[PDB]
Design an enzyme around this catalytic site. Sequence first.
Site, PDB file in Angstrom:
ATOM      1  N   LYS A   1       0.823  -1.202   0.000  1.00 50.02           N
ATOM      2  CA  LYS A   1       0.000   0.000   0.000  1.00 50.02           C
ATOM      3  C   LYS A   1       0.864   1.262   0.000  1.00 50.02           C
ATOM      4  CE  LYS A   1      -1.426  -0.015   3.909  1.00 50.02           C
ATOM      5  NZ  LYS A   1      -0.081   0.556   4.197  1.00 50.02           N
TER       6      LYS A   1
ATOM      7  N   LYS B   1       4.167   2.155   5.353  1.00 53.71           N
ATOM      8  CA  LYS B   1       5.311   1.559   4.670  1.00 53.71           C
ATOM      9  C   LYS B   1       6.537   2.461   4.714  1.00 53.71           C
ATOM     10  CE  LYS B   1       5.101   4.348   1.052  1.00 53.71           C
ATOM     11  NZ  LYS B   1       6.230   4.968   0.316  1.00 53.71           N
TER      12      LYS B   1
ATOM     13  N   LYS C   1       7.528   8.635  -4.524  1.00 56.46           N
ATOM     14  CA  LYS C   1       7.277   9.891  -3.834  1.00 56.46           C
ATOM     15  C   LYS C   1       8.560  10.614  -3.461  1.00 56.46           C
ATOM     16  CE  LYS C   1       6.308   8.118   0.828  1.00 56.46           C
ATOM     17  NZ  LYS C   1       5.233   7.542   1.695  1.00 56.46           N
TER      18      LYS C   1
ATOM     19  N   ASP D   1       1.636  -0.303  -3.227  1.00 55.10           N
ATOM     20  CA  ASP D   1       0.262   0.021  -3.576  1.00 55.10           C
ATOM     21  C   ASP D   1      -0.162  -0.658  -4.873  1.00 55.10           C
ATOM     22  OD1 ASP D   1      -2.096   1.260  -2.826  1.00 55.10           O
ATOM     23  OD2 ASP D   1      -1.165   3.233  -2.593  1.00 55.10           O
TER      24      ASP D   1
END
Lengths: 400, 424, 265, 255
Positions: free
Chosen positions: C11, C16, C42, C129
Amino acid sequence: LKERGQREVFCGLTGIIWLHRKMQDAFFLVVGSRTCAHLLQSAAGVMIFAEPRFGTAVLEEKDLAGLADANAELDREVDRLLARRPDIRQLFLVGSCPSEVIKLDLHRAAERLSAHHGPAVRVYNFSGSGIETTFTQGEDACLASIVPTLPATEARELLLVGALPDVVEDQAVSLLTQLGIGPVRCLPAHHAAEAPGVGPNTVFALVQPFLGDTHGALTRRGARHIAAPFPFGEEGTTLWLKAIADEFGVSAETFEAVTAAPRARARKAVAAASEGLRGKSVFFLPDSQLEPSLARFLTRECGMSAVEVGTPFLHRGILGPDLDLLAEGPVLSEGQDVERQLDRVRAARPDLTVCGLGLANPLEAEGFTTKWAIELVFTPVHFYEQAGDLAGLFSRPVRR
Amino acid sequence: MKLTLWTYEGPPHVGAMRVATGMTGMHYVLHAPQGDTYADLLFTMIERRGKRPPVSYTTFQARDLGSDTAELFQSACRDAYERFQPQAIMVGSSCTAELIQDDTGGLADALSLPVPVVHLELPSYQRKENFGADESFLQICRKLARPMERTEKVSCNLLGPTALGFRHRDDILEVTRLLEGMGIAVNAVAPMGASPADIARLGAAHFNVLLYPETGESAARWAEKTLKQPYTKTVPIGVGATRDFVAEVAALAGVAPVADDSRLRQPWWSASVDSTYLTGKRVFLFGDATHVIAAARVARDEMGFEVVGMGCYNREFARPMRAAAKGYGLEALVTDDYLEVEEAIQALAPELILGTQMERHIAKRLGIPCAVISAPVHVQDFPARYSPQMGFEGANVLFDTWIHPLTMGLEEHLLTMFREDFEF
Amino acid sequence: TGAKVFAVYGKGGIGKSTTSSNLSAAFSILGKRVLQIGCDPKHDSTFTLTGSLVPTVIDVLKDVDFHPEELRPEDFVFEGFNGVMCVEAGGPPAGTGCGGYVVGQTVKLLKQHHLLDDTDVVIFDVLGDVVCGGFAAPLQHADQAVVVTANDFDSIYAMNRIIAAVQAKSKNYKVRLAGCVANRSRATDEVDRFCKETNFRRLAHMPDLDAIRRSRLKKKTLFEMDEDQDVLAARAEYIRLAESLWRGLDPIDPHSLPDREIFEL
Amino acid sequence: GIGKSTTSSNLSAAFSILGKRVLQIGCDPKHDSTFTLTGSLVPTVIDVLKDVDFHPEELRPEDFVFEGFNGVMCVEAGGPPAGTGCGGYVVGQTVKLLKQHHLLDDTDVVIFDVLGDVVCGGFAAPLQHADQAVVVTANDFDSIYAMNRIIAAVQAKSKNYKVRLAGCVANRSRATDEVDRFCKETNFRRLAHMPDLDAIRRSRLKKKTLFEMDEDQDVLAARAEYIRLAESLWRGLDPIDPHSLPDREIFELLG
Ligand code: PMR
Ligand code: SF4
Ligand SMILES: [Cu+2]
């Protein structure tokens, strides 16, 4: 016969070094990896610095993980090089160890390149890898590549199948025409203009000893082999000229008149170089396959006792003519791993220790006066007029 | 795919071979095709190293293209152990066995030889000999060099020198002289004269010294963490670099920065009125990254040469190369072919181009004064005479070697001027 | 391999990242050398570890002609708390191609520059994810595949997704699913029971959602720099995690439950 | 990431009432986005591949159309069967393949409500069809970054399809103001869509969504907002000037 060992001989691509000297309108595109590129860079030495026809296109990682892309890209790079080199009329693709393992269709590549390039550039392929070949054998393969293409002529012609320098091949031709008719057609054509008419009755004169498969390829066209001991001394040269003469038909008187001046020309020179070789032990290691001819000459003329005449590739139908003059005393052993003959050299200490360049310096430091056979192929010592020069080269009695 | 005519760098297995041949008693056995032993020629002739390099190629042929190659390697290792008794042994493969995977390390472990075996992973298609050497050195340091007690005397290890290296053999002597002069004792030079015992002792030094970052940066960086050992950055080629290096190792060890410069004649021999035509001459430095950078720091700062070009072939060292190129106002030529540099100097036409052997040869083809400073060389450039390139005597060597082309040019220019005029 | 190549999957943005960083600080406390790889696009995985955003491998890698050789350590890898090396992989900016090409390149980079030799703990903070060839690209090198999830049945469905993917990858590898970790979710009664039906090991967690305020308490992770009351209990939990991973536990093997069997309420 | 249960229903049910009944093929392999308009989760979703390794009956002749309260008669989708494949088999070859397998010729209107986790960085045909509905976003720092990635996508999908766009609804989980400033930086829209009593009351959402459960929008009036967004007014305008921001500026909040 390496006993799973270190066979010091080079991969056939090193022959390209002098092949490009011979056929001055021929380019040689090698598809080897950086190892083969370094080999050409080194073994050529100063060749690299004067625009040599030594394309060593390195196959990089992109050429890995793909087959059709590889030879398409090869096509592209070839087209680019003829764009930079329009003078070339025969391109010599050569098989490399990387080319063999990746299973590059060198034949098909050469075919498509010839097709889109036309007769203007007759690109040819052959194999010079170390996985198959060994040093000189590369020259054998390279000339065998052009052998089928050469025009078919059923008329009785002579073939000078050898890459000797002009001051050697021209002298050979001059002598042959001096006694015989001399329909001599040098197979390593100096330019594409002199396309030799190989054929059934076009019996080929083999002059460079290392040429083995050549025999087969030329005999496929019907070109027969003269059983002439190899022109490399007072015996090899004389026998070669004699056999070539009677093969075409020459009176003994004409032969004697033609070869009388060379005979005295070389007898004095060989003697004047032989006293440095008078009664000493020799040892031929398997570098380049001229050793049987060198033993046939030097052992019997300069009195160099023949201990072992090593040979990486022994031949029976070609080496036989000079094998007849060879004494039985020398060991006819084939090319073993470096340890074997090196220990033999250490045990039976030879005065002159002809070997590969790699062992030349060590055995020189190991108390062995050494002459590297690498010098032989470049130095023009393969006929009558240079028989004494060859003996002087073998002499090397350096004192401190 | 690219058409190559003169590769500046050999394949990486040549670099591993250089490290092995450099040091004593470590047999770099190879999974190579029959014929790949050509590399032995480089060490036996250009370096004129007497004994055969301690390397045993398997030399496989058309007979051997399957598991027989694995058996060849198995034999090669066990043989090499008994016949060529080493204290340490390398494994690895050339291009051919790189494609024909044989699990070299697995084979070596299968023999389970009592002497340590250093598994070498050498990508032989995307990297080059400088890598090969650095990677091989790193692998043998992580396999043999373990942390241990510091020598009671302050001591350093020279890392970087490597067989078949541009004046490496002389440069170790010069730097050893300088380091002893300051007071630092050299613990173990590796890998040019070291032995596996010496590589074991590596950790005992207080700080490694990087003579040649090309072959030693990986080793020094690994030593920084495993052995807790700082390593000096300033390679001491030329007077200014020598001063900085002197100060640097002085700080690292703790000893005074006194170094005997009574053999320094270059500052005087270039400041002399004779060396006034040399001011503002255009030069094109090419070749090894560290050599080029330090040679530029000499050319523009102690000789008066104006650097008009600069270039390199160590892509690994492109970053410092580019930084220095900005430093001198130029643009670095981080290339790997002779065509680019050839076009570059033709456009630039510097008076004194200098660098690899190619620079000398296409200088001659262009009739431009030519010198040699970088790695790729032939047997002539490997001299018998004591000619270091670092330290003070290295500075003098640089001076004379660089202005010799210039002196030749001036004298020939005069000779053509003289004995020659309008006929009528 | 030569290190405990952990894989923090499961996810996005829920545990995480924070779980990976705080576990890294846990192994730093244990003393074993730690490697955190922020494969998540990210570029935020290591932010709390260094207290700052890290230039991704893709950034520097494109800063040169995609040549790893020019790059060196201490240029793309940056240190963090307790001397923990930590790298980042910058997910492609919709450059089509492969969405895990960057993480593969980071693996190549670290292995090349010998960053992936000396280190003992390597926790690949990879995006969990999504399921695409690239997200499980470094799963090959992984050895324990830690999955993190929340109590929410969306997170649990994602957890099942991870099991399916990692079982498919481990059909050709010996990587083991280390254990389902809850992520600041509260009651794990559902999570423990879901693990039971999958037979999966429900690794314990710390329930509170506010041990950190946010951003890992202004980039200061629990172990990194934090002295709150619940911080202490969480710290005990994460040391428990660290020792559990380092010792090694039972080879738990969850069977991939179909979605219907998963509580669809 | 968001369940999209509170959205896939309570955007265009009034459109399905207005125009032809929507088919509402929203990507949700958890069976949690579209089902709310239907009577239940209906996990069947014609997941059976009746044609041998092909979509059942080739082009399925509208044999699914699960009926719903407010004229739904739609189908749902979402499944990770393949699992493996980099750009050629799973996210490279979505098991749905082209949406043309389903009779778009007969079910013209379709509602796409993909999760939006920048899936299938390879295959780029899906998640971009239709002209009525687009990726629905929410309000969360990870969520805003992800939908920024969605922007970067659709800008990179400008030549793809008809770049329908028209904006997207920032599902307002709460009164967070970061979405407003973020959209100002991206020159986008945020309006308001509050999810409440939707994920926790799913026993009632399973059949009827909030605007049709007991008329739960009676105190949560948001259907007129959608009549502006969907239905007659449609909010065509411009595509609300989308502008994806790189990583540093998507860090405009502490994050
Ligand atoms: C592949 C390695 C190698 C190197 C270092 C070169 C260059 C060179 N090879 Mg020898 N040479 C190698 C192999 C071969 N050399 C070649 C060429 C060449 C000649 C003609 C000569 C020689 C020699 C050398 C030498 C040392 C002397 C020189 O630079 O000329 C180099 C570096 C040198 C000699 O053997 O001793 C005097 C010499 O006169 N090689 C050839 C024959 C085609 C090959 C296969
Ligand atoms: S499977 Fe993953 S890595 Fe491969 S193309 Fe699709 S998104 Fe990219
Ligand atoms: Cu001179």
